Amino acid sequence: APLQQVGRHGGPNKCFGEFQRVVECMTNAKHDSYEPCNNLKNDYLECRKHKVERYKAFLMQKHAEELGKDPEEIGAPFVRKRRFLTSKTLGLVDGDDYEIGVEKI
Amino acid sequence: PYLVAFRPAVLVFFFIRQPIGAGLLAGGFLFWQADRHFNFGIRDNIHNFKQTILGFPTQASKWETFKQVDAQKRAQLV
Amino acid sequence: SSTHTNDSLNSSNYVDKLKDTHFVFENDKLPSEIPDVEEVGATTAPLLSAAYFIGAKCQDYNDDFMLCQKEAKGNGPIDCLKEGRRVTRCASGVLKDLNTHCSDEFRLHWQCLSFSNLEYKNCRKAESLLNKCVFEKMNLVKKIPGIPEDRQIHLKQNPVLKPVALHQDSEVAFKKAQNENSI
Amino acid sequence: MDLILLMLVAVGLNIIDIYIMIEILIMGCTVNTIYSASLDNDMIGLIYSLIQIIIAGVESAIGLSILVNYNRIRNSEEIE
Amino acid sequence: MNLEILDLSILGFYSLISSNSFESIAILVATIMPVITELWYNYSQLFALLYTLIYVGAVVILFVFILSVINEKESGLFILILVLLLDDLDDNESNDNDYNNVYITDYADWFNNYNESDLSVIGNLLFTEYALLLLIISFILLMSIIGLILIVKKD
Amino acid sequence: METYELIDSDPKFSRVVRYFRPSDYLTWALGTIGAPGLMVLFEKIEPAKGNTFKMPPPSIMRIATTIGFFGGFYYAYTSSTKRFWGYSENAKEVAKDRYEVKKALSEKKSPYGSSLLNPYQQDMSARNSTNSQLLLAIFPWFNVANHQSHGIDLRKYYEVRDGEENWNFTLPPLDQVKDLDVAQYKEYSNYP
Amino acid sequence: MLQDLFNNYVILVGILGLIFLGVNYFIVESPRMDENNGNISDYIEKSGPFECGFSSFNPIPIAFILVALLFLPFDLEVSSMLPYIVSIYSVGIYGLIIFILFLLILIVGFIYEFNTKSLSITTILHKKNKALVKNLY
Amino acid sequence: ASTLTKEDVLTRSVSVLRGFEVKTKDIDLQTTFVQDLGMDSLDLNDALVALEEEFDVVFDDKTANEIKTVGEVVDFVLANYLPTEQSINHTIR
Amino acid sequence: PYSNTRRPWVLRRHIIMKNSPTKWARKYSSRRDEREQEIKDDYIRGMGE
Amino acid sequence: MLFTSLLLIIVYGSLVNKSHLLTKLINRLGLIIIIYTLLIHLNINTLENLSIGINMFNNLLLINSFNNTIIELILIICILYVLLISFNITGLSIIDNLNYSKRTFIVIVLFNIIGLTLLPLVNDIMILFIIIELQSYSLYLLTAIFNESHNSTKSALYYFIVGSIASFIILDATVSIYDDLGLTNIQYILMYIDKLEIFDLLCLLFGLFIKIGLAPFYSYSITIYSLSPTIITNYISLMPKLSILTLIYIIMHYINIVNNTDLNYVISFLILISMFIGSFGGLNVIRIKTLLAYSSLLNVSYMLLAILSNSNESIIAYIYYIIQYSLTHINIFSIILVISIYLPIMNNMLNVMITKYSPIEYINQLKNLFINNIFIAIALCISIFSLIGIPPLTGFYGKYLVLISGLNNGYVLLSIVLIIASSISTVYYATILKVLSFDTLSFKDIISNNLIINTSPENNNNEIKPEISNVISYVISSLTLIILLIIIQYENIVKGAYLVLLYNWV
Ligand SMILES: CCCCCCCCCCCCCCCCCC(=O)OC[C@H](COP(=O)(O)OCCN)OC(=O)CCCCCCCCCCCCCCCCC
Ligand SMILES: CCCCCCCCCCCCCCCCCC(=O)OC[C@H](COP(=O)(O)OCCN)OC(=O)CCCCCCCCCCCCCCCCC
Numbered sequence A: 001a002p003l004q005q006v007g008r009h010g011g012p013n014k015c016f017g018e019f020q021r022v023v024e025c026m027t028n029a030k031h032d033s034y035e036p037c038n039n040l041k042n043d044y045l046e047c048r049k050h051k052v053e054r055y056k057a058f059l060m061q062k063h064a065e066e067l068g069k070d071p072e073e074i075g076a077p078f079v080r081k082r083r084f085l086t087s088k089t090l091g092l093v094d095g096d097d098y099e100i101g102v103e104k105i
Numbered sequence B: 001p002y003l004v005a006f007r008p009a010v011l012v013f014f015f016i017r018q019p020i021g022a023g024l025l026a027g028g029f030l031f032w033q034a035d036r037h038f039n040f041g042i043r044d045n046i047h048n049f050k051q052t053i054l055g056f057p058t059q060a061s062k063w064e065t066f067k068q069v070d071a072q073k074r075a076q077l078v
Numbered sequence C: 001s002s003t004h005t006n007d008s009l010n011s012s013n014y015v016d017k018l019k020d021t022h023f024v025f026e027n028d029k030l031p032s033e034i035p036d037v038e039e040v041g042a043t044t045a046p047l048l049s050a051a052y053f054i055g056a057k058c059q060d061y062n063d064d065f066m067l068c069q070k071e072a073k074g075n076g077p078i079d080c081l082k083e084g085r086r087v088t089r090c091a092s093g094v095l096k097d098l099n100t101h102c103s104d105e106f107r108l109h110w111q112c113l114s115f116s117n118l119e120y121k122n123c124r125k126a127e128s129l130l131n132k133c134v135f136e137k138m139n140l141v142k143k144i145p146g147i148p149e150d151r152q153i154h155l156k157q158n159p160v161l162k163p164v165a166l167h168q169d170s171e172v173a174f175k176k177a178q179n180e181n182s183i
Numbered sequence D: 001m002d003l004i005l006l007m008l009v010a011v012g013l014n015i016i017d018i019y020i021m022i023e024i025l026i027m028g029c030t031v032n033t034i035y036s037a038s039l040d041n042d043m044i045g046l047i048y049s050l051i052q053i054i055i056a057g058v059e060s061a062i063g064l065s066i067l068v069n070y071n072r073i074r075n076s077e078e079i080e
Numbered sequence E: 001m002n003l004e005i006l007d008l009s010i011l012g013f014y015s016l017i018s019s020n021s022f023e024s025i026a027i028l029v030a031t032i033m034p035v036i037t038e039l040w041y042n043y044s045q046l047f048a049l050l051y052t053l054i055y056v057g058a059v060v061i062l063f064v065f066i067l068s069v070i071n072e073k074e075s076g077l078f079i080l081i082l083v084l085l086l087d088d089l090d091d092n093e094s095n096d097n098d099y100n101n102v103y104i105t106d107y108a109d110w111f112n113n114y115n116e117s118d119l120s121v122i123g124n125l126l127f128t129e130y131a132l133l134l135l136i137i138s139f140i141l142l143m144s145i146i147g148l149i150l151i152v153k154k155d
Numbered sequence F: 001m002e003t004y005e006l007i008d009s010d011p012k013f014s015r016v017v018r019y020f021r022p023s024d025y026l027t028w029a030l031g032t033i034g035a036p037g038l039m040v041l042f043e044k045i046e047p048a049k050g051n052t053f054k055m056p057p058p059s060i061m062r063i064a065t066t067i068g069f070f071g072g073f074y075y076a077y078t079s080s081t082k083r084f085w086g087y088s089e090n091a092k093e094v095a096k097d098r099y100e101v102k103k104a105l106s107e108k109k110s111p112y113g114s115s116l117l118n119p120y121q122q123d124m125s126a127r128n129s130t131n132s133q134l135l136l137a138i139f140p141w142f143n144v145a146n147h148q149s150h151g152i153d154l155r156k157y158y159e160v161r162d163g164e165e166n167w168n169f170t171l172p173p174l175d176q177v178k179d180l181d182v183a184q185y186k187e188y189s190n191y192p
Numbered sequence G: 001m002l003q004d005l006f007n008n009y010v011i012l013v014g015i016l017g018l019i020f021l022g023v024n025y026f027i028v029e030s031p032r033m034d035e036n037n038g039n040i041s042d043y044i045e046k047s048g049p050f051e052c053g054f055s056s057f058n059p060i061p062i063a064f065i066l067v068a069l070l071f072l073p074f075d076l077e078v079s080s081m082l083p084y085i086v087s088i089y090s091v092g093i094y095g096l097i098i099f100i101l102f103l104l105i106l107i108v109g110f111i112y113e114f115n116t117k118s119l120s121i122t123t124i125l126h127k128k129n130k131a132l133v134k135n136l137y
Numbered sequence H: 001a002s003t004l005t006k007e008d009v010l011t012r013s014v015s016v017l018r019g020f021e022v023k024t025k026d027i028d029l030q031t032t033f034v035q036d037l038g039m040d041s042l043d044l045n046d047a048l049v050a051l052e053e054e055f056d057v058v059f060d061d062k063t064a065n066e067i068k069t070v071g072e073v074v075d076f077v078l079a080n081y082l083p084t085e086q087s088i089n090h091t092i093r
Numbered sequence I: 001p002y003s004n005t006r007r008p009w010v011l012r013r014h015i016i017m018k019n020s021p022t023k024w025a026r027k028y029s030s031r032r033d034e035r036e037q038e039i040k041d042d043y044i045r046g047m048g049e
Numbered sequence J: 001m002l003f004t005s006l007l008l009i010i011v012y013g014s015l016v017n018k019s020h021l022l023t024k025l026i027n028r029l030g031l032i033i034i035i036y037t038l039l040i041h042l043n044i045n046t047l048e049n050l051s052i053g054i055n056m057f058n059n060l061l062l063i064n065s066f067n068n069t070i071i072e073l074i075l076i077i078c079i080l081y082v083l084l085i086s087f088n089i090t091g092l093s094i095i096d097n098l099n100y101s102k103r104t105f106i107v108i109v110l111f112n113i114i115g116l117t118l119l120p121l122v123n124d125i126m127i128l129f130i131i132i133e134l135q136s137y138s139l140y141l142l143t144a145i146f147n148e149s150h151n152s153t154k155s156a157l158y159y160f161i162v163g164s165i166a167s168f169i170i171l172d173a174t175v176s177i178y179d180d181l182g183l184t185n186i187q188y189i190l191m192y193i194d195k196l197e198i199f200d201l202l203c204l205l206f207g208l209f210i211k212i213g214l215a216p217f218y219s220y221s222i223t224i225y226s227l228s229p230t231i232i233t234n235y236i237s238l239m240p241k242l243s244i245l246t247l248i249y250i251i252m253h254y255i256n257i258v259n260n261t262d263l264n265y266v267i268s269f270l271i272l273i274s275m276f277i278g279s280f281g282g283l284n285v286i287r288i289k290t291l292l293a294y295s296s297l298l299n300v301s302y303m304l305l306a307i308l309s310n311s312n313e314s315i316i317a318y319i320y321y322i323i324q325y326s327l328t329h330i331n332i333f334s335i336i337l338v339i340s341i342y343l344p345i346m347n348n349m350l351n352v353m354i355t356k357y358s359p360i361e362y363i364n365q366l367k368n369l370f371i372n373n374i375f376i377a378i379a380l381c382i383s384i385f386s387l388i389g390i391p392p393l394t395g396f397y398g399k400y401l402v403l404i405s406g407l408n409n410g411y412v413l414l415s416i417v418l419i420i421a422s423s424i425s426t427v428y429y430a431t432i433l434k435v436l437s438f439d440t441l442s443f444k445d446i447i448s449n450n451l452i453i454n455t456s457p458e459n460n461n462n463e464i465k466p467e468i469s470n471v472i473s474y475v476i477s478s479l480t481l482i483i484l485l486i487i488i489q490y491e492n493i494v495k496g497a498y499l500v501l502l503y504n505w506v
């Protein structure tokens, strides 16, 4: 049966494993109907888009407001510029805030 | 990567060729770029208006949906 | 290959700008019940130099870790952590051993690799010194599975593909041992 | 403001302008495919995109070949 | 400050005021270049090049080839600006608010020790897995070669 | 339905041509000379020019034979293929196939043959050519590779049917035949 | 990997383009300096077409138009062989046999244009001759 | 198509004729050219060429010495009126 | 790296390239979202039971 | 068989000189190629073994007993079609030399036949978008085969532009489905039939609706058919519908898995409008090709009612309808191509211009056909009566079977409208029959040697010289009696329709 969801290196990508378990569930001879494979199909679409997972993030962002919580103290610290991943930010003991080299590897 | 080189030339030729038109499209472009920078909430509310009128699931409707589910489950424990 | 992915740093800061990429840190640690392990602290050049010596010393432990993944049925990261520490500890063993036994030959090799684009074909002379010193202190022999013994590439006397630029330290150390050890 | 068919104003008033709009429209479907193939990390979608570029290329040639013959027809008197 | 938006705003203007076939051709190039550049960054670099080699290199210089053999003959400003400003209000082609405003990540894996370019995989599949697609496309190109001659060649 | 024994769900090109019954060559013989004849008969039904019979040009009688030759082969090729799939009488063929497969197993050689294709490409070349004959009218495609997805159970070549005990064949167990799935993955489960 | 250095190069060439545009607008002497006779827009004589001095008032052949149209197929053929270049090894013999078929189909296109002489510019409008024959009565 | 009728030619013909020195301002189909309007060779050619500029119909050398009345010219335009061929842009789009 | 997954700006802002039968359905029709909202809502309805 | 010999003809075509005798004989080799394909196809393909459906070419193409029959139908209609160019239709060189000038006419047909047969078999979106182009391009090339003509070229340019828009609509839907699911193969998509956006399959059909000319997209098909030469219109107005109505049926078979009520209403809106436009459209028209173009729209409207209903009676109705309308369409266009030899000749009024591409263009050019050739007129009347629905002609059972499937699924409104549009349409089919015979007796005593057929010289004046070619007359005679005498074999033939299966099984 033809391949789907081939990663950039020629092997299965992230969401192929969830795709195979749908095909195995559907074509199996033991199932009277396709009712058993309803959750397996919901996981495959979850893998590709993460829509349910993104919804859970929308609620957490929305719910953090109503209690007065600030994202500075609950959120995950992040750096937005790739030249400012400084050794001080990286946690190196002797590191200093100078810009790192990203001009040419 | 070709537009990055061609962008300096065309922007110059946009103001020289049609100066009055350039001052608006570029001026209007800076407004929305500023608007998203400063969280003016305009384009967000222009967006929420469309989702309300056209029956789409709005951001407010989901949070109202969560409240209905939240309020129901809590009284189920009692 | 060099395609933009969502997992590691992409080509240019403009790519990060178009995607609005955020580089996120996690300040937590592994939960207390998960035993602690000291991660391997070697960079690319030391590992590429010692990739085969790590394989010889840790062959039984590499296979168990990868076999555990197959038998975990997609649940590898949680069901093969105990096996994951065995591979890390064995790998740290070889790097420490190469540092207290063959320290001179080790640095001469991976410094040649850093000098010549990490390509194994450009540092044969710094490698023959390391293989001989390792075999006389750790009993580890480099082997490339699948082909006969007399067809392994690093034993070819006249390789067709030689480096454009000769490493000076590789030539000096080779000639220093050319007459002393190899009388 | 697309439900008022605004794009028809943006099209030129010649047959060659209609040809351009179609190729722009077909190019929109390839950019969407490359968007879908890359995010899914799927190389099957990138094969589809390669076929769309190749197939849409042939359609361009056949269209201009018909147009050139059609345009030659008006100036096909050839008396001298 | 995404400067990609400004360029499209310009192109959304000269498309409305286009008068002769010079303007329409320049619309095609001015559409391809934002396509090529936004693909060179962001999503796929291989197909940013494959556009230039095929779109511009084959069709667009054939557009201007035939156009020189066709012809060269010949509201206001507030309406065109008003049309653009209202058209610019909404620019979310999708309506999944959670899928648009929430960011994601992927976790890298070291299993693919055989790293290869995306073109090698495409060749490894288009020439083996889906050979029929390749052989039909060759057949289509054969039809065009015979097709283009019969239409144009008078004799 | 008139089913029979399923010899080979994906018969090889060399084996399909080998199992041509003498009738099959006759079909190919008719088609190769039928095409020049049909061109002649068409002139009999109505001449191309005028109102009188005129034999078509000798040049056309040459190309029509080529069309008939490559046309009449497929009628033979399709007739032989239906005997492999089980759609046509294959009592003669089953005897021939079982003798060769038993001979292959007896000599400790694969029934299918050695291949230049890695295990994936064998699987890939199975899907491309299997059942391709159902479109052989529209465009040709043939199974020219020595793959192994022939949709059979090799143990059906172990038990001895009627009239086969005389061949005196000895068959080793499947785990010792060169070029088989069961006898290839002995060291690494990822590589043959 | 890492094309920030290339990005700066692209910026520099773009910036360098304006310098070609602008340097003339600043270095050249103003119209009043040389002869003052008129601006470029006003000097219609200079700002006009050149036709070897004398004032005057592309219907290209079929072949030239036909060569251009046939470029589109053959260019898509060549540009579709890119996948086989980076994967010539892994596809092995199977890809090589497919690749040759992908050309033999296109060779028939090449063969067809060869026989009909579609590429030749052709000279039928002129170069006609006849043999004089006496018509004695 | 040819949208000119007989009246349309006749109505617009007078205006051109009202633009040239004519003995009488009453001109209809029965009116002549040389007699009623007193036009000689050069005088009559300008009016005949002028109707060529408005009706966009060319008069040949055969009819040159055979024109005697203004009704003939009005009827001639109908028999010899065609719309100029429109380029590929005007026709179909 | 956490990043967005939106379509290219040229896809959703060209005056021509953004118009197609399926793109208008995405942009102006709630039929796609009403169904796909139920799955999201079921995540919170299926917890307490 | 097609691919092997099509390349042979392409190389052989340009090797020999350009002469109408060599071209005609090469056209006959096209007939022989198609005939062999049918024998080779029938030899290997059976209804019994294809009932399950057999995947081919890495599951890119899937063939079952339903798609198999249409492939056999497509090949057979092409065999009758090539008899129009491989043999003389009229006999007079002036009107028949148009079919022999273009050598690549048969080559283009064989390109389209490969596209026609593979289109119902597509099982992946990647190969769907390709195969539709192989067929679509072959139509545009065919419409422009006569490049000296001004109308034929303008037809192809108009055809190319609309067909490209339809291709983009088809392409966009497949990309939208790919974006939601990430899968390509249709059988893989069937697993997610409950979670993809079902209207994206409707956007796919809207592309296919344009190509077959369904209202409100009917405008271009009528214009194109009325302009292309009669030898061309006979092929481009029937073949694309054979290979697309089948594909539409397969997609509709998949869509009815979920049984979306909103999707039926939208398609029923198009079906309802098409019967209105296809019936009232042809009331006020003077061209015969424009009339048959409106007839084609109405009979496409009737078939789509069976496809939308999509039950076990739809297969019986659609299979029978597509076969009978194809033969009738061949029969009428075969007659119109032959009765061009009775045209009068002047010796003016309205300055009516008749070109050698379409010698018969207006309905009033069929006058006194009852007088000139009564047997031909009866064949034309029988063919016209079938489209009306006079029982027991083949046309009557076509509407009887469509109404059975339409009413069985609750399409009460569309069934009543289909009947009203059947009654309205009868007006402009009777007009054809009024022209032929209604003035027979007032013109029984006529002196007329001014026919086109009278130009041919008298060869012997003793031997009997038939007015028409042997082959083309025999095809008309064979098809005329099939329509009239179908009552004998109808029960057996319908039994043959019972056996056609599309995943019915049990
Ligand atoms: C800042 C905001 C910017 C927004 C950009 C667009 C501005 C608005 C442009 C015009 C909008 C009209 C179309 C509106 C969206 C399309 C219809 C739709 O999607 O539904 C929305 C609206 C009400 O839908 P609703 O009942 O709320 O659905 C909730 C279900 N849970 O549905 C309706 O009831 C709308 C009324 C439509 C019915 C009358 C119009 C149809 C008849 C004329 C059609 C024109 C001719 C078309 C002919 C078809 C061709 C065959
Ligand atoms: C390197 C950049 C150089 C840019 C030179 C032109 C700058 C003007 C802005 C054009 C770019 C905006 C995108 C729209 C495409 C052009 C369509 C157009 O209408 O161009 C108009 C141009 C200026 O003439 P204007 O007076 O403004 O308009 C009325 C003319 N009767 O008159 C013309 O017809 C253009 C004549 C030259 C055509 C050259 C080919 C077009 C440019 C291709 C390279 C630019 C790539 C696009 C860059 C912008 C992307 C948004």
Ligand SMILES: CCCCCCCCCCCCCCCCCC(=O)OC[C@H](COP(=O)(O)OCCN)OC(=O)CCCCCCCCCCCCCCCCC
Pocket: J272, J275, J276, J279, J417, J420, J421
């Ligand atoms: C007892 C049994 C008898 C059986 C038949 C009974 C029903 C017969 C119905 C006939 C009644 C109307 C016919 C006569 C009324 C005259 C109509 C007309 O001429 O047009 C009038 C109007 C414009 O006025 P004007 O053009 O000046 O005409 C003046 C004529 N004195 O123009 C109009 O008003 C036209 C109205 C617009 C057209 C609307 C069409 C909607 C569909 C109408 C039914 C068609 C069938 C639909 C279903 C089949 C096709 C899907």
Ligand SMILES: CCCCCCCCCCCC(=O)OC[C@H](COP(=O)(O)OCC[N+](C)(C)C)OC(=O)CCCCCCCCCCC
Pocket: F044, F045, F046, J470, J474
């Ligand atoms: C033996 C078993 C096979 C039967 C033959 C089948 C092919 C016919 C070839 C015979 C030779 C021929 O055509 O000879 C030519 C004759 C007569 O021609 P005419 O009209 O008088 O022209 C004038 C000829 N003069 C000048 C000699 C008088 O034409 C026919 O007979 C026409 C019969 C039509 C074909 C009938 C077959 C229908 C099959 C239907 C399947 C779907």
